[PDB]
Amino acid sequence: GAVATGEYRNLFAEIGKSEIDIQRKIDEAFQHLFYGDAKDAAVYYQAGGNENGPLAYVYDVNSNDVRSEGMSYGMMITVQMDKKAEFDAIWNWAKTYMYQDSPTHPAFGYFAWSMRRDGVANDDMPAPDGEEYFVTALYFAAARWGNGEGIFNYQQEADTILSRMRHRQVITGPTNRGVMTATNLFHPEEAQVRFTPDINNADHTDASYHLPSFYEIWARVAPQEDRAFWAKAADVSRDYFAKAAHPVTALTPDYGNFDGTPWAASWRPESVDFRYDAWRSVMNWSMDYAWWGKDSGAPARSDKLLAFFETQEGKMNHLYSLDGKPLGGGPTLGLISMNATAAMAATDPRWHNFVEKLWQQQPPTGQYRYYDGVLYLMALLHCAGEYKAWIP
Ligand SMILES: O[C@@H]1[C@@H](O)[C@H](O[C@@H]2CO[C@@H](O)[C@H](O)[C@H]2O)OC[C@H]1O
Numbered sequence: 001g002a003v004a005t006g007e008y009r010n011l012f013a014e015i016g017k018s019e020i021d022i023q024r025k026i027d028e029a030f031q032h033l034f035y036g037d038a039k040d041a042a043v044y045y046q047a048g049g050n051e052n053g054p055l056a057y058v059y060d061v062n063s064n065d066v067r068s069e070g071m072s073y074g075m076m077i078t079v080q081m082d083k084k085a086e087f088d089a090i091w092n093w094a095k096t097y098m099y100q101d102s103p104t105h106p107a108f109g110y111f112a113w114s115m116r117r118d119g120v121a122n123d124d125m126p127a128p129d130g131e132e133y134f135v136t137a138l139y140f141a142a143a144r145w146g147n148g149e150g151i152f153n154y155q156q157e158a159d160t161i162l163s164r165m166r167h168r169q170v171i172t173g174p175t176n177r178g179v180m181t182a183t184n185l186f187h188p189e190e191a192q193v194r195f196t197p198d199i200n201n202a203d204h205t206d207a208s209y210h211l212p213s214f215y216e217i218w219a220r221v222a223p224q225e226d227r228a229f230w231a232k233a234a235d236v237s238r239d240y241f242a243k244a245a246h247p248v249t250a251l252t253p254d255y256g257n258f259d260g261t262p263w264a265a266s267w268r269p270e271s272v273d274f275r276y277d278a279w280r281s282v283m284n285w286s287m288d289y290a291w292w293g294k295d296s297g298a299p300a301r302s303d304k305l306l307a308f309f310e311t312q313e314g315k316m317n318h319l320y321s322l323d324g325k326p327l328g329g330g331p332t333l334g335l336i337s338m339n340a341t342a343a344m345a346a347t348d349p350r351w352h353n354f355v356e357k358l359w360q361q362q363p364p365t366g367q368y369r370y371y372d373g374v375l376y377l378m379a380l381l382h383c384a385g386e387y388k389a390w391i392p
Contacts, residue, residue: 001293003216003389009290010385011343011355022384025359029380030081032363033373041363043370044074044086045117047093052151055096056089057117060370065122068098068111068130073374075137079390080381084145087137088152094134095151100124106171106182109164110197124175128165128185128193129209135162136214139221143390155221155392163223170199190258191232192240204263207244207252208280212237212295213288213389221392234288238295241285246322250304252281253322262322273327274320276371279338286344287382291389295345302342306350309339333364333372337379344382355383 002008012022034044047055058074059066071094078087097119100107105124111134113127138158147153165185172181182197193211195204215237218230243260245252253262255271262272282305289298308324309316317326318335340358343351358379364372381387 001289001291003291003391004293008385008388009344011340011351011383012359013385015352015355015359017359026081026377026380026384026386029363029373029377030077030083033369033377034083034086036363040365041369043070043373046089047117049089050092050096052088052092052096054085054089055093056086057093058090058370058374059117062367062370063114064117066093066098066115066117067127067370068094068113068115069127069133070370070374071098071111072130072133072137073378076133076140077374077377077381079137079140079144080387082144084141087141091138091141092151095157104171104173106173106175106180107197108171109161109168110182110185121176123177125180125182125196125198126185128195128197129206129211131161131165131185132193132209132211132214134158135165136211136217139217139392140390142392159223162218163226166226166229168197186229186233187258191229191236192258193233195255195263201265203258205240205256205258206254206277207241207256208254208277208284210237210240210281211284211288213284213291216288216292217389217391234292234294238285238288238297241281241295241301242297245281245301245305246324248304249308249320249322249324250282250301251308251320251322251324252278254278270327272322274322276318276334279318279335279375283338283341283344283379283382286341286346287387290344298345299347302344302346302351303348306339306342306346306348306354309354310350332368333361334375336361337372337375341379341382358383 032041036042058070074090098111107124110126112121114122135158138154142155168184181199193209195206212234215230215234251274254275254277255263265271285298289295316331318329318332319327340354
């Protein structure tokens, strides 16, 4: 695995691209998304500052809301790209405005998943893959830059947040939406991330939230009393992808049950299909395989998913039944980008075509560029051999 060797595959170099052109492609994507035209290209906004220095956020330009996921992805992108100033400004806004510090609030220890640009929460409850990326990005920051003090003691922040994600108690109290009850972010017996800590829907998961590549980091550097739990979560997630991904297409549903079956949310029953969340599952298991080499099923799964998408050439949808029926939409940059990341584990040389398709793309513009753009820039970093485990 790359962590053992320190050698991360440069999949773009493997399909013949020069290092100068790979650097240009990543820098163009960063400059567009972080510093491009505010109305058409950028998803990052400089939002003044406070006692900790500059504030900034990554946001969904469509709804015009800040998302905890996009903040956490901005932190991961910026630490992988050695962009400390941008990292610190995003983290300052997330910790200042999104993090719930009241111990009587049911979201204590968690980041509001959806927040207006003025800091008014739409929902105090979290999207738990945001927390997973925040903690990991903070550990990576500690490793690359060393720890600062206060909110910039990245390792201390990560330890405290991650401990509370596991050990949170049930809290009932007032929220922006009325009285709510929430629990921990990982089920203590299943050792799986929840879709939500809201007690009304807590005993569910989401395959795209399963991040065994990161749980292995936490198994090494988290508070000692939790390391066995995070190690377990990594093994459970590898088993989860084996059960949750269709046996023929390797498509996963957006939302799921702990036993691997798809879950139809009452408010979103189409969550049983492969949609916007599920795009990411293949990145998660392929990254885990490339880093750690433990998910013995990952190569075949990535091969099945790329074989399936090869049947869709010239008629690509972005919504599918798990058995591979197209359910609508055309090609998206986010799905192209995630499919390319399957090459971190695929064995069949059709993966070349998927990495080449990502290489051919341009940075996204217009109303849907937030999800397309964060996935694009993460996929470019993975495929350039520039998305690494920075272990403190
Ligand atoms: O109260 C809970 C809501 O907070 C939860 O909202 C979800 C949070 O993650 C987002 O990615 C989803 O889009 C959003 O629906 O839904 C479940 C409910 O119990």
